Amino acid sequence: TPEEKLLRAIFGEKASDVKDSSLRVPNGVSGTVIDVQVFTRDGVEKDKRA
Amino acid sequence: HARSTGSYSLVTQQPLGGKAQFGGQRFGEMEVWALEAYGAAYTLQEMLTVKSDDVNGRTKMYKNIVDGNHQMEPGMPESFNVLLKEIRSLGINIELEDE
Amino acid sequence: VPLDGGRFATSDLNDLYRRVINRNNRLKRLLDLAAPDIIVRNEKRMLQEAVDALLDNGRRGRAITGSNKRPLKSLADMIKGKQGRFRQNLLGKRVDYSGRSVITVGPYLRLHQCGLPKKMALELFKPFIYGKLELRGLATTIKAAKKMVE
Amino acid sequence: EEFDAIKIALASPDMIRSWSFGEVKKPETINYRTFKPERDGLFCARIFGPVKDYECLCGKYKRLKHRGVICEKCGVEVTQTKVRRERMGHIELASPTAHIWFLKSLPSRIGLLLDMPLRDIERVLYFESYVVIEGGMTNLERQQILTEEQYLDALEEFGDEFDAKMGAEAIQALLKSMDLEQECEQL
Amino acid sequence: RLVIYEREAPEGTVKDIKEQEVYMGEIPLMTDNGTFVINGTERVIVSQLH
Amino acid sequence: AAAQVLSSVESEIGRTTDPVRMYMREMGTVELLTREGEIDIAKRIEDGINQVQCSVAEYPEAITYLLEQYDRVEAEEARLSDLITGFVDPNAENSIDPELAREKFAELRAQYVVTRDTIKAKGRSHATAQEEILKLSEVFKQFRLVPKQFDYLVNSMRVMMDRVRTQERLIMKLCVEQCKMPKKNFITLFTGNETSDTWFNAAIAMNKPWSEKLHDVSEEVHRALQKLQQIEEETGLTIEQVKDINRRMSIGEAKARRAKKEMVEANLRLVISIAKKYTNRGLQFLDLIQEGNIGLMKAVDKFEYRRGYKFSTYATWWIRQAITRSIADQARTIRIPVHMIETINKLNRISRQMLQEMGREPTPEELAERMLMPEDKIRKVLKIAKEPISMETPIGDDEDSHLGDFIEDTTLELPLDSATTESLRAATHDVLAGLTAREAKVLRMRFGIDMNTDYTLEEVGKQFDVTRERIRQIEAKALRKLRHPSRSEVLRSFLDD
Question: Which residue range or ranges hold the RNA polymerase sigma-70 domain (chain F) (predicted)?
């Protein structure tokens, strides 16, 4: 909206072109991560933790 | 499970989440009868329009609650005029005789 | 509409509508090619059948089924029945500001009182809390009021 | 906004045109790589409105400022997206067809108005036997079924003097041709 | 086996004999405990009384 | 003798409603008219076409266009384009050589200039004139036109047909419907005179006091007869032979149209045969049949019996084309272009054979290696093949919860997002209030807070009547002081939400 336009042009803060869709624990749940499994296609470089 | 506001379905425009915040409590026909029995017309009207389907109504009344004003500006539920469109698409001219 | 996996999800009417237009278009072509009237007759039969399956698949002697092989849902099937608009989305609706939970006895209660979990009441009364926090000044910002509530 | 009553009637074809914002001409839904509504298709943005708030398809007119305008490049109107939910289209049928609700109801309303057994209507509609819309000759009466070879014979004696047709064109001619005051008073 | 007969001769069986192992379908196997591992989830098919 | 069994059938049907049965009864009425029958039917067609050819041939000026537009297409110093592909192309019972065109057009124009001489000599249809017209027609008979221009020319003939008919209808209306003149005497007088108002005043000469009462429409009767004449002098071709040519072309067209019907109605069964190797692909059986039937109509149009080949081969080729092309044009919710459909089917076939060779479904690397195209397009096409799933499918096993009940509308605004942006609006209003009038106004018009549109620097410079960057300075100053913490604290907080 024009007002966000003014806000970002005053404090000089344009939002990044990358939105976050990170996986997070569902609300009301606690716990202890006991296992992580990473699956990658055959043809994509494996990141460090994989 | 609890819910103040969240996801809304696509066609009918009525409460239905589920991923984290689930869909709202269904207020079926029997409960509509119970409120009609009590004579509570305003609780019924808000449970039909501004709590469920009335889009302008639902957002306007969230704004009113945040302001500290508890009042309702109800319109017409989405499901009703979705029904009007679906009946009209059967080649049957149903309208609303305005004043 | 696109589902998560990249697949799409369509209301059956689209399929039904498609038939009509397809058949209608074929008819618009046959009348130009001056087809043998047996073929034009068959096309008109199928056009009538497609419109009928659109308006009411059941009432139509044979119900058109899609790739699922279960019958398509016509226009009349959406405003009709227990699952129709009337009985399911117009007399009884899903409702905001509503939760549910297991019940137990509060034998210390008075007749006009019900226990209510703190978490459930916090989630149900959330906009009221936002307005009150803004009013007290504890949160001059709705955005930070949400932060305080969380 | 407030209304008082709700009226149902029958939708005149002129009225169905009056509701519509444009004729649907193709069975195409959306594009397969761009996933954007195709012209004249079932989802066309010219007919049923724009896909995003205040944006034509080609992005020429792309802000609130240019609301109400029809982008000449793509024909879209710059308006809210909610009007994908309120605008209707219309298919111009290339041959009249029977409304099944008013024919296959238990008390057929077409069959009562005309007073023609539902079997005879189903035979005419399914393109199975003719029917006399109107005959100047006296031996043939209105609403009299003429099977195919019987039609051929009847054509042989007189020909133009009697009008017999097949299908929903015939039934529309029958419904259109009766006069309601006269049958009302005779009955 | 594909046997091809000649239609001129009465039963001229040896016009073509063609034997080849073919692959048709995969069939799930039962675990040692009466279950199937279908799509990673363990399923049971219950008997039917008809 | 098939309708005499259908009579009993329809009198004793089991209340049938299936269009398959109704069609299959009616396509079964007409019997297989093939082999000798087909050749006879094919001759009835070419005879109708040749009658139409001759009927065009007696009219000279249409041939003029033949040489006219050709001289048009040759007009641009070199051409072999669509228009030339549309001219004669005499089929001797490739690359176009214009020398042949000149060779075959020189004698045509020679006949043009030699036949007209005797048309005026001693009579319009003189014996020598008639013989030369017949020679012209015989020479023209071997010019088998390409269908597109041939249909254009028969259009140029039937337009004159219909304008003659419509002018006659208009005059018939204006005369009979108003003045109530008898058509019996009209027919004979019109055949007799056809050119002057001698018959008009002649029929009026018979006492008929009503025939006197035409003065108010006298200035219209012979004025419309003026146009009726002008038609004839424009054609320059007498009305009786116009009617003769009209009847010839009508009968010629009706012959061919009648002949093609037997071919189509006989090979309907062939259509049904090919259409049945195509079911379970999105289009219903009778949809595949009706596309086959259109393909069969094309095959009948393009069939040439002189080749000596069986008709079913050609028809099969066209019918399979129409069916398999429609099953690709339709039968998909999200239309896939035809060539992409073909590539998908290539992948399906190759996947089958690799599946049975290996014993595993091939990976896109091996599949790309086999099909000879990069893995990028392999994976693209694989993603394309998916068709929309149904919304009313039962994600609950009972008929309780369908898929469409779980589809969120992800376009709505989550209410508490800064109080549907109201809080930001209020806070901005407050902060701009603390600024001087000119700064506030220009700041608003620039970004647009509560303004009609977002006036650009140029526009706002126009508004305050300063054609310079004073506005830019002003905006810089304003933005500057609204970062100063003491001035903006509440506003700064929403940013880092």
Answer: 287-300, 456-482
3-state SS track over F180-230: CCCHHHHHHHHHHCCCCCHHHHHHHHCCCHHHHCCHHHHHHHHHHHHHHHH
Same domain, F378 and F422: no
Give the single-character DSSP code of C88: I
Alpha helices (H) in F59-177, listed in sequence order: 60-73, 82-86, 98-119, 127-140, 147-172
The secondary structure of residue B27, as a DSSP letter, is: E
Residues F420 and F397 both lie in one domain: no
Instruction: Count up the domains in chain F and report the number.
Output: 3
DSSP state of E43: E
F305 and F416 share one domain: no
Which residues of F are less than 8 Å from A3 in CB distance?
Answer: 421, 424-425, 428, 447, 449
**F138 labeled part of a ligand binding site:** no
F344 within some domain: yes
Rounded-to-integer distance, Cα A5 and Cα F424, Å: 12
Specify if F4 maps to a domain: no
Task: Report d(CA D14, CA C142) in Å as an integer.
Answer: 52
The DSSP call for residue F248 is: H
Is chain C in touch with chain F: ≥3 Cβ pairs within 8 A?
Answer: yes
Contacts of C74 by beta carbon, 8 Å cutoff, 6+ apart: C12, C13, C16, C53, C54, C55, C56, C57, C58
What domain range is F288 assigned to? 17-76+96-330
Q: Which two tokens stand for residue B37?
A: 């029995």
**What CATH number is given to the structural domain containing F451?**
1.10.10.10
Residue C123 Cα distances to C8, C120, E39, F325, angstroms: 34, 5, 37, 58
DSSP state of F363: P
- Position E41, amino acid: T
CB-nearest to A42 from F363, F443, F449 is: F363
B contacts of F420 (beta carbons < 8 Å): 59, 62-63
Q: How far is F32 from chain B (nearest CA, A)?
A: 44
CA–CA dist F55, F198 (Å, integer): 32
| Of the residues F367, F389, F411, the one at which a domain ends | F411
Number of neighbours of residue D40 by Cβ within 10 angstroms: 18
CA distance C121 to chain B (A): 8
| Residue F168 is assigned to a ligand binding site | no
**Is F30 domain-assigned?**
yes
Considering only CB atoms, D32 lies closest to which of F15, F330, F336, namely: F336
Domain boundary among F373, F395, F411: F411
In a domain, F84, yes or no: no
**Statement to judge: residues F405 and F429 lie in one domain:** no
Q: Please give the single-letter amino acid code of residue A3.
A: E
Residues F342 and F203 occupy one common structural domain? no
Q: Classify the C-alpha dihedral F330-F336-F338-F341 as positive or negative.
A: negative
Kind of pairing between the strands at E2-4 and E16-18 = antiparallel
Based on the fold, state whether residues F101 and F113 are members of the same structural domain.
Answer: yes
Give the single-character DSSP code of F246.
H
Task: Please give the full DSSP string across chain D, using - where no structure is assigned.
Answer: --EEEEEEEE--HHHHHHH-SSB------B-SSS--BPTTSTT-HHHH--SBTTB-SSSSS-SGGGTT-B-TTT--B---GGGGGT---B---SS----GGGTSSTT-HHHHHHT--HHHHHHHHTTSSEEEEEESSSSS-TT-EE-HHHHHHHHHHTSTTEEEE-SHHHHHHHHHH--HHHHHHH-
Cβ of residue F10 closer than 8 Å to a chain D Cβ: yes
> Could you tell me if F393 and F456 lie in one domain?
no
Resolution to one decimal, Å: 2.7
Given a contact cutoff of 8 angstroms between Cβ atoms, the answer to whether B2 and B14 are in contact is no
